[PDB]
Amino acid sequence: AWPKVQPEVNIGVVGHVDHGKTTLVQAITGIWTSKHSEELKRGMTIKLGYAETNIGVCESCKKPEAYVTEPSCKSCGSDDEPKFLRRISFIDAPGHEVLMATMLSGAALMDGAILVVAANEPFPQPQTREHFVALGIIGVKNLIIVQNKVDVVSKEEALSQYRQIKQFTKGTWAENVPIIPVSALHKINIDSLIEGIEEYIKTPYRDLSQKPVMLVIRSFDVNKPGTQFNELKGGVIGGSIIQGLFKVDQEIKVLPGLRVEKQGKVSYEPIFTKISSIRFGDEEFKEAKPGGLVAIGTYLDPSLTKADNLLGSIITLADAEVPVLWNIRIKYNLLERVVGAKEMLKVDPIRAKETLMLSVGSSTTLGIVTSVKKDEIEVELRRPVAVWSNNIRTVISRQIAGRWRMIGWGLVEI
Ligand SMILES: Nc1nc2c(ncn2[C@@H]2O[C@H](COP(=O)(O)OP(=O)(O)NP(=O)(O)O)[C@@H](O)[C@H]2O)c(=O)[nH]1
Ligand SMILES: Nc1nc2c(ncn2[C@@H]2O[C@H](COP(=O)(O)OP(=O)(O)NP(=O)(O)O)[C@@H](O)[C@H]2O)c(=O)[nH]1
Ligand SMILES: [Mg+2]
Numbered sequence: 001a002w003p004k005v006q007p008e009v010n011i012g013v014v015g016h017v018d019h020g021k022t023t024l025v026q027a028i029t030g031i032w033t034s035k036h037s038e039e040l041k042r043g044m045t046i047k048l049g050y051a052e053t054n055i056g057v058c059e060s061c062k063k064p065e066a067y068v069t070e071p072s073c074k075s076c077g078s079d080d081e082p083k084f085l086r087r088i089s090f091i092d093a094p095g096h097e098v099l100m101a102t103m104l105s106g107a108a109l110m111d112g113a114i115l116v117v118a119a120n121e122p123f124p125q126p127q128t129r130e131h132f133v134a135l136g137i138i139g140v141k142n143l144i145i146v147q148n149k150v151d152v153v154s155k156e157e158a159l160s161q162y163r164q165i166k167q168f169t170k171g172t173w174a175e176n177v178p179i180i181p182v183s184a185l186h187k188i189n190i191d192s193l194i195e196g197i198e199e200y201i202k203t204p205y206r207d208l209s210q211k212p213v214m215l216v217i218r219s220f221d222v223n224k225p226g227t228q229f230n231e232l233k234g235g236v237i238g239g240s241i242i243q244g245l246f247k248v249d250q251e252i253k254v255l256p257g258l259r260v261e262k263q264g265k266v267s268y269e270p271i272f273t274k275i276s277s278i279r280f281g282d283e284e285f286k287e288a289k290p291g292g293l294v295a296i297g298t299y300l301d302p303s304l305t306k307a308d309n310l311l312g313s314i315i316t317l318a319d320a321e322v323p324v325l326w327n328i329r330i331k332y333n334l335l336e337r338v339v340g341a342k343e344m345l346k347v348d349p350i351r352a353k354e355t356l357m358l359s360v361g362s363s364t365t366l367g368i369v370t371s372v373k374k375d376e377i378e379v380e381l382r383r384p385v386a387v388w389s390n391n392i393r394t395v396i397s398r399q400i401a402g403r404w405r406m407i408g409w410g411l412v413e414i
Helices: 021-029 037-042 097-107 126-138 155-169 192-201
Strands: 012-013 049-055 083-092 112-118 143-148 180-182 213-220 236-243 253-263 266-275 277-280 283-285 294-297 314-317 324-334 355-360 363-372 376-386 392-400 405-414
Touching: 012 021, 012 097, 012 126, 012 236, 021 049, 021 083, 021 112, 021 192, 037 266, 097 126, 097 355, 097 363, 097 392, 112 126, 112 192, 126 392, 126 405, 143 155, 143 192, 155 180, 213 294, 253 376, 266 376, 294 314, 324 392, 355 376, 376 405
Parallel strands: 012 083, 012 112, 112 143, 143 180
Antiparallel strands: 049 083, 213 236, 213 314, 236 294, 253 266, 253 314, 277 283, 277 294, 324 376, 324 405, 355 363, 355 392, 363 376, 392 405
16 A cells, blocks of 8 residues: 655646646646636636645556556556655646736745646747746746647647747756656646656755744635534634644644734734644645645634635744734845736836735735835835745736736845
8 A cells, every 4th residue: 555645745837828737737636626616617727726646656667657646557567566656746826917926826835846838839928938937036946847738739840849948948047957748638648747757856855843834825614514513623724834844732823813903003913723633635644744735724713714814824833933024125136027928028127106016925915115225125015924034035026017017036134
């Protein structure tokens, strides 16, 4: 048998709208990540999607067919059990141009990524460029490029695009990243992709001794109709642990917390609770480490967690000292081009009184620029952000022609 363990790595799936990200995750894991009404009606990803799979290898078989996602080798001609390698998970991002901030929130959780490029569309499309640049900014450098939809183009066309893609990465951080052609729809060459994931997206080193921090991307009420009272539960909070670890029965807090009034002023009150349960996918555990999207059960009123109410928060231990800042100072750099627009315009300098969008961890917040210098801006936010370390990366967006566009990045200085 294979062990039941949490996923140990998060692989982002990014790329232009409809290039096949979600179909690819389904080809690997058997799971369709889209769970929301609007996603199903529109045929698009809106919220971050998630799926897990075990990975193993049939030692008696040849590669790539030796790589499997279930404990059997019958497909490659062996009655032996495959050797378990690890459990992996996917963070499935939206490709739509208006959902770039959601891709950025997911990118904060990624240990590596697959950039999906459709073989039957001109290259490079706007969000092919924009997601690529975002991965570079955030430092997600363990990248595989997947050339999808090869089932609907000729060999010649696929080869032409392949050369295009290699030339695009030439002279960039991604110069040596592999390109793997697949059909996600017809599940062609998925075994080569799993081999690629093992070779190029290794599980990173973790630091389990640092103060535990989880970035929150989901929160829910898990109580369903027709359930007996003794099976009812408190609110659940979902996210990825970026350092340290968490255990059942630990006292924790959610930051910045709840928006309340305190002395005629808006304030955020930290939400204190205790971990009642820990789950990854359909499995319960007593502790949770980095890797995977964990569901942290709490004793909170489910009205507090319902419908992603806490998206963008962080969870720490109750006694941790974490800055929660309404005003932030950013050591910044600007991109030269608005890469995500259909026509790449030049980026204008930041000016005082501009409203900008700041991506910090899993959070997205608007703020007004109160001060500009050569390498520093100060921003007054509409909601405070939890800043759990010094030199946390932020991505900066500006509204241009009715869309939020990534224009720069920086370090939050505390
Ligand atoms: N011919 C072909 N169609 C494919 C392939 N992969 C996906 N598609 C089709 O492309 C469309 C979009 O697929 P989807 O997986 O939703 O793409 P996405 O990149 O996740 N979209 P979004 O950016 O909105 O999340 C669907 O009609 C799907 O069936 C493929 O390998 N071949
Ligand atoms: N820690 C914890 N997580 C739970 C519990 N029940 C459900 N979850 C998690 O909360 C999330 C929401 O689950 P749910 O609202 O039941 O819908 P769901 O995700 O469709 N359920 P399922 O995936 O099993 O069909 C999932 O990640 C699930 O694993 C619980 O008792 N404790
Ligand atoms: Mg999708």
